[model samples]
Target: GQLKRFSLRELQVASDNFSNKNILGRGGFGKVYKGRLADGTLVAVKRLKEGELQFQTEVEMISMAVHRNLLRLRGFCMTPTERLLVYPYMANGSVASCLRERPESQPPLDWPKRQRIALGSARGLAYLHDHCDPKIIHRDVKAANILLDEEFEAVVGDFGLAKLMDYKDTHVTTAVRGTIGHIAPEYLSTGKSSEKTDVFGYGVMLLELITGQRAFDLARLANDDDVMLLDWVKGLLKEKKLEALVDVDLQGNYKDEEVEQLIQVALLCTQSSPMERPKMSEVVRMLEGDGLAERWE
Candidate 1:
């Protein structure tokens, strides 16, 4: 019951021999396929782009950090040449998916759903950072990694760059891995990951959520010679035009007050100095309507 052991053959069959349509998402690591167990249960099988990886240890640690808002590892498959991790399939897919410009028949996420997502995501990270037995750090916390269930609850996934923060250790000096635009400056410069790095990543995720834009839309903005999402948001924030930042998808429907408050938290998390950023625990509290004014000062 702890974790199911799946065979590579069965997984291949469940994934229709790894057909393209069953593919959920892809990244540098590899592709995640939408698969089903023989019993008819659905899962997202993460087929790694590696060989003989020492993945069992990382999988065990990932299993340990469980919360309602955290993705639970369903099982895994390993072979001489194949390594895969199976996770519960989220019906609605990712936060990033819902933000795309949808056709009239396809509805984009509403304002309230985005608000719920921001809070739900913060709570999950807070739990991982503070409640896990030894604590956990998601080196990558972005729109793609945060999934949405049938009910649209935020479920943070992907241990690809996660780390276990042994209680005795303050930070890690492991070789850093990050998606562009999400890495904290400190982590990038020093190759270290700590609680603050997660905050910085989460902050950028917030900007993406608010604007419904990719954190790293390289070519899209290159023509204008614009800046990163963080800088762009900061520039808009400086102009005090809160409304301009809302995803036109939300189309002036979201409450301005709530958007401003969440943006304030986003800015706080993205602060240049990690020490100056609010902790995930504090972020959780702030999103709950407790202490933003004081923290803003």
Candidate 2:
């Protein structure tokens, strides 16, 4: 995919020489900084350390795959010691940060806004799975990779772990790579990745949106059966206690029908069999109220 290439000097200038003050976040591969390009365009510059060819190539491909629900890649810069990716700065930051409870200062997110974010994020994944020339499997799709704009609309970000697969290919045999609680069970056992693996991750994120809990809580004892978010939600579902699964902060504010519908959709996505999960586009339709919500027996 063709993209605008930048020189190291230009990126350094945009990011203020990679000063600590400009840092926005850090990840396994590198750090992201907020920058202002020469043309007065605000950008987020992701700088990766030397010798990471895979990360650089993934960013390059993601840059060419554009959608409104995805973070746009503006350009890239490369040197012997580092690789830098330039993107439009998202004003609100990642959805994971927004989902965290502020210490009694900010109010809980309302149901309507949360609903919009879920739908928008799903649409972004749908585009990646259904629209790309060679479909891209976003190996990671947690809330942390779902960014937000000034208006808080969701934008799927972080494509470093994405894998490209031909439309005719059923799955790609690769090392299992993804956040623990979000990884599909079949993928974990078989080391096979497909669109369904991404669907599983999205399901975990939907549970986070509804329950306001981390997918995996390390603080809990390993023996505790309810420590995993999906297990807890499934337990509540079995007991017909769906309301208990909703974030208590919502205070019964969300529409019951919508809440129930989304919960059903989430469960359907997490079905153990890849064939049981709905395609990303079908998930979008389900979220939009035009598709049926089915449960696995």
Candidate 3:
């Protein structure tokens, strides 16, 4: 269904005049607030800066496409003074927030839940990269953009920098925009991007999920300031540090075999050569389970 537009006054009442307590989080271009509807359904309302074409474009784009793994725009508010899009409230919050805050306090995630989160995220990206009519390049796929529902299911978010593919042209060129450590190296260097950019970002996110490590840990990468998670992992693989690369937080929690397979997938996605990277669809297949993955080999 198409999204309905709400009046600014109505949104004000619904969002409590944008109360400070309602604020969920803030980005450079906008702030998201917690809001409730007349029927008591909770929502996260994003209020973008006035005159930002990218914000409006994202609303229009998402309104036309809905996927279970992707965040849906329930409705929007567009007035001369404000631009906002409403989404279902995520109780578990973003992965980045969870990781940084250490809410669960330990390893914090079980193997099954971790696998679900990884696969769910890959499915969402697959939809954008292949299922959407015009196809979409998320441009920003990071732990922060991945939210979890009450059931701990993954839901991808934040589409302001997404690029739409052209029917006539196989590739589209655009300036690089995304969190520093999440940006694809080639795209960051030349402004050339494709599904591979998002894949690279996903790989970094996978590494974070597996090891409970930050993508760019200044303390760990201090001697080599150029190191990012992807690069660091690859270096470890070559230097025979796979066991050492595992997070200490996971001390005795997960199986060594599963972690090894996940590391293999991460490395494949983060391969230095874009051409060598697998598409999200293939990643989904590999993520299905051991049975499904073994069928390919």
Candidate 4:
């Protein structure tokens, strides 16, 4: 009964009337801005740019999905033609930005933090798939979407928001709505996304956490290797000379055994047959030190 729905007036004032300079990022769905409330609290306002009427109801549903690992919706600004969803501003941006997109002064994240990100993100998705009343299938799950807080804790953004924003695309739009290299094989061909498909994306996110690289890129072409990160990882793993797979930024600061275990988990999740892949519940258990080796076999 206490779901906070903000008025457009409060949000507009806080966001400087949605100033262009304050835009955190922009994409097909809409743009997000960094807003500062009268109380000096920082907030992220996702200003949508599409059709809506039932969006307020759905946004409330998303806010109900509260978990430490999941990004919590603080409130929303709702009215005709101008709808915005508000959330806590993450100080550290996304894991993707931290991994490869930041300046050298910021430095790449260390192994310990990445491990937490891996597990924390997995747990958040596990909550979405296993615990939510109406299961939220994150059609897009990648490093760019997994945000980090002040403590570097993983606070997954854009979980159920994808479908809400994809209203313009999914219905008879033939739009395969997601980033490349993250979409599961079957999903791309069939567009019949399921929780298992989200699991497939989660597995690839594990690889992103390990390698500190993008899922799809031509960067590897210089070495005449696979352009896709998954195949590239598969090739190098097959070589069994796994020493070099660690990202150069780490400079050998990670435990070899743990990296191998994570890779094992990732591969199991992305198995060719989605049916063979473990559910998020099983994935969580494996990450928490149970049943990984047995499942690998």
- Superposed by TM-score, candidate 4 places the C-alpha of residue 197 at a distance from the truth, in angstroms, of 0.5
Query: Ranking by TM-score, best first?
Result: 1, 2, 4, 3
* Whole-model lDDT values for every prediction: 0.83, 0.81, 0.79, 0.78
Best-to-worst ranking by lDDT: 1, 2, 3, 4
**Model 2: per-residue lDDT, tens digit, 223-288?**
475778888888865688767778888886888888878888888888888888888888899888
> Per-residue lDDT for 236 in model 2?
69
Q: How close is candidate 1 to the true structure, as a TM-score?
A: 0.93
TM-score of each: 0.93, 0.90, 0.89, 0.90
Query: What TM value does model 2 have?
Result: 0.90
Between candidates 1 and 3, the one scoring higher on TM-score is: 1
Model 4 lDDT, residue 255, Cα = 80
Clashing pairs in 1: none
For candidate 3, what is the TM-score?
0.89
Off by over 4 Å in 4: 50-54, 160-175
Candidate 1 runs further than 4 Å off: 51-54, 101-104, 167-169, 219-225
lDDT of candidate 1?
0.83
* CA lDDT, candidate 4, residue 249: 84
Residue pairs clashing, model 3: none
Q: How displaced is residue 157 in candidate 1, in Å?
A: 0.4
Model 2: residue 45 alpha-carbon error in angstroms: 1.3
